[PDB]
């Protein structure tokens, strides 16, 4: 049928079910279009802007928007959102005294921000020295996603204007002189987005990103990915709970992540850029509310997988890709290889498990370990007969020794430890088992 309730050039029956854009004309989705590279889009048939961003569903599905906007935004349920933040490369104090800073702006969002002019705070501990806004010659004309200003290979811009900024008086900078440093925090940021007008030109003057930030933040759910070197932040739309007139489609965490980060699915495993981002491969950090709702929804589910929980608005997720990951199959980046390891099993998580040869103990130096920050040891444990006891002892700033009773099924344990001190000694980690235990997916991740 050709019924169009919201007048956005897609019929309602096509929005309720799948649809796709062919020759700039929305067509009903057929299962055979996946071979050609087409994608199945779904959206809300009562809304012209399903994700809250300035570009409608037909402008996002058909790619009729700015070409710098990433393809992850082309999904009508993923918002085109620029997440920008002022970095810091140098802090120059000029003595009475004067403050000079070399700042560089970053963008980890999905759409470019034009005329970037952030507002920043100069804080050292609690108190704020001054709030400074980039006035005229510290404004980024262009800032594409996953790009910086000034661009890579260019020196950071100076930031020294306000009369002028100096340390307050002689009775406060002693705090800095006693071994404390000033920090830079971005309270907000102002920019404009690009639209095509009647003449076909692109105008970014009357536009403003500060108009759609509240709407996008209140409609969608935040998801953040970390890959050690780079981080990405995305917003995925979700429907209200007690609202019958909210037609936003419901998706679980798995396909939400796949849509937000355009991860390619090789049947079951999910690779972002060659780095697996499956539930077991990585670790997820939640706040209180999201953890509570995920657990409550999960205790009804027999599958007991996080990636199978329906995504709801107001849910914050953080994904940290492990740095020291080994699955005894195809990768092991530990500087010191594991001892007493056998690769002859058939009950592994994906291909094969680890046949423990009694006691395994490895020593990892601090050459490849960042100091002064805690790390987490994570892995999978199970016992078909539960006839053995597993205890762990870790040599660190404090003597850490704990015991655990493995369950009959695949259970993922998480034990934390902090490596304080820059010039700390060689950290010793020990795991003790009564007998032979089949384990898999040992991971060490920086926090």
Least distance in Å: CB of 356 to a second copy? 39
- Select the span of 41-49, 268-276, 335-343, 438-446 touching a second copy (CB under 8 A): 41-49
Which residues in the 269-288 window bind a second copy by CB under 8 A?
A: none
Least distance in Å: CB of 418 to a second copy? 22
Comparing CB distances to a second copy, the nearer of 192 and 354 is 192
Q: Name the token pair of 234.
A: 């995305």
Tokens 């929305």 belong to which residue?
26
Q: Does 5 bind a second copy (CB under 8 A)?
A: yes
Comparing CB distances to a second copy, the nearer of 13 and 363 is 13
Least distance in Å: CB of 66 to a second copy? 5
Residue 8 assigned to a binding site: yes
User: Residue 362: which H helix or E strand, with range?
Assistant: strand 360-364
How many residues lie near a second copy (CB under 8 A)? 93
235 contact choice in a second copy, Ca ion, none (CB below 5 to 8 Å, kind-dependent): none
308 contact choice in a second copy, Ca ion, none (CB below 5 to 8 Å, kind-dependent): none
Site string (204-223) toward a second copy, x via CB under 8 A: xxxxx-xxxxxx-xxx----
Comparing CB distances to Ca ion, the nearer of 6 and 383 is 6
SS3 at position 254: helix
- Burial grade of 333 (CB within 10 A; 0-12, 13-18, 19 or more): exposed
34 contact choice in Ca ion, a second copy, none (CB below 5 to 8 Å, kind-dependent): none
Q: Name the token pair of 340.
A: 């007493």
Widest Cα–Cα separation across the chain: 77
User: Residue 175: which H helix or E strand, with range?
Assistant: helix 174-177
Q: Name the token pair of 41.
A: 């889009």
- Select the span of 314-322, 325-333, 412-420, 426-434 touching Ca ion (CB under 5 A): 325-333
For residues 33 and 20, what is the distance between their CA atoms, to the nearest angstrom? 9
Residue 216 assigned to a binding site: no
Is residue 36 left, alpha or beta, with left meaning phi > 0 and alpha meaning psi from -120 to 50? alpha
- Select the span of 61-69, 340-348, 399-407, 411-419 touching a second copy (CB under 8 A): 61-69
Are 147 and 230 a contacting pair, CB within 8 Å?
Answer: no
Q: Name the token pair of 33.
A: 């279009």
Which residues in the 15-34 window bind Ca ion by CB under 5 A?
A: 15
Residue 329 assigned to a binding site: yes
Tokens 């030109």 belong to which residue?
201
DSSP class of residue 279 equals T
Q: How many residues does the chain have?
A: 447
Q: Does 244 bind a second copy (CB under 8 A)?
A: yes
Which residues in the 97-136 window bind a second copy by CB under 8 A?
A: 100, 102, 112, 114-115, 119, 121, 123, 126-133, 136
Residue 47 assigned to a binding site: yes
For residues 268 and 179, what is the distance between their CA atoms, to the nearest angstrom? 51
- Find the discontinuities in the chain where C to next N exceeds 2.5 angstroms and give the residue preceding each: 95, 162
Q: Name the token pair of 90.
A: 């140098």
Q: Does 406 bind a second copy (CB under 8 A)?
A: no
Q: Does 23 bind a second copy (CB under 8 A)?
A: yes
Residue 352 assigned to a binding site: yes
User: Residue 188: which H helix or E strand, with range?
Assistant: strand 183-192
350 contact choice in Ca ion, a second copy, none (CB below 5 to 8 Å, kind-dependent): Ca ion
For residues 61 and 40, what is the distance between their CA atoms, to the nearest angstrom? 10
Contacting residues toward Ca ion, per CB under 5 A? 4, 6, 8, 10, 12, 15, 43, 57, 327-329, 348-351, 440
Q: Which residues are annotated as a binding site for Ca(2+)?
A: 4, 6, 8, 10, 12, 15, 44, 47, 57, 327, 329, 350-352, 440
């Amino acid at each position: 049928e050709d019924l169009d309730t919201d007048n956005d050039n897609i019929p309602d029956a096509y929005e309720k079910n799948g649809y796709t854009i062919k020759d700039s004309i929305a067509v009903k989705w057929n299962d055979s279009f996946a071979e050609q590279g087409y994608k199945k889009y779904v959206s809300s048939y009562l809304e012209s802007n399903t994700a809250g961003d300035p570009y409608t569903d037909y402008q996002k599905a058909s790619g009729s928007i700015d070409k710098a906007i990433k393809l992850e935004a082309r999904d009508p349920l993923v918002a085109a959102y620029p997440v920008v933040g002022v970095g810091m490369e140098n802090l120059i104090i000029s003595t009475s005294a004067y403050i000079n800073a070399n700042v560089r702006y970053y963008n980890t969002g999905t759409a470019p921000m034009y005329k970037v002019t952030p507002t920043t705070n100069l804080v050292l501990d609690g108190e704020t020295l001054a709030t400074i806004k980039a006035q005229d010659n510290q404004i980024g004309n262009n800032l594409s996603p996953n790009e910086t200003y000034p661009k890579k290979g260019l020196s950071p811009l100076a930031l020294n204007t306000m009369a002028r900024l100096i340390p307050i008086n002689y009775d406060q900078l002693k705090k800095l002189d006693s071994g404390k440093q000033i920090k830079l925090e971005t309270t907000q940021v102002s920019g404009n987005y690009g639209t095509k007008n009647s003449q076909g030109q692109i105008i970014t003057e009357g536009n403003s990103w500060s108009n759609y930030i509240s709407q996008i933040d209140s409609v969608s759910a935040s998801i953040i990915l970390d890959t050690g070197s780079q981080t990405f932040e995305r917003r995925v739309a979700a429907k209200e709970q007690g609202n019958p007139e909210d037609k936003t489609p419901e998706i679980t965490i798995g396909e939400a992540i796949k849509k937000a980060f355009s991860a390619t699915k090789n049947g079951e495993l999910l690779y972002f850029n060659g780095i697996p981002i499956d539930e077991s491969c990585v670790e997820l950090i939640f706040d209180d509310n999201t953890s509570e709702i995920i657990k409550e929804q999960l205790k009804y589910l027999d599958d007991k997988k996080i990636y199978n929980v329906k995504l709801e608005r107001g849910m914050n997720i953080l994904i940290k890709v492990p740095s020291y990951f080994t699955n005894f199959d195809e990768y092991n980046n530990f500087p010191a290889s594991w001892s007493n390891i056998d690769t002859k099993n058939q009950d592994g998580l994906q291909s094969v498990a680890n046949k423990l040869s009694g006691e395994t103990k490895i020593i990892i130096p601090m050459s490849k370990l960042k100091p002064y920050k805690r790390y987490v040891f994570s892995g999978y444990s199970k016992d078909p007969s539960t006839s053995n006891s597993i205890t762990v002892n870790i040599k660190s700033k404090e003597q850490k020794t704990d015991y655990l009773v493995p369950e009959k099924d695949y259970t993922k344990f998480s034990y934390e430890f902090e490596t304080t001190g820059k010039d700390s000694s060689d950290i010793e980690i020990t795991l003790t088992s009564s007998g032979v235990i089949f384990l898999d997916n040992l991971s060490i991740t920086e926090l």
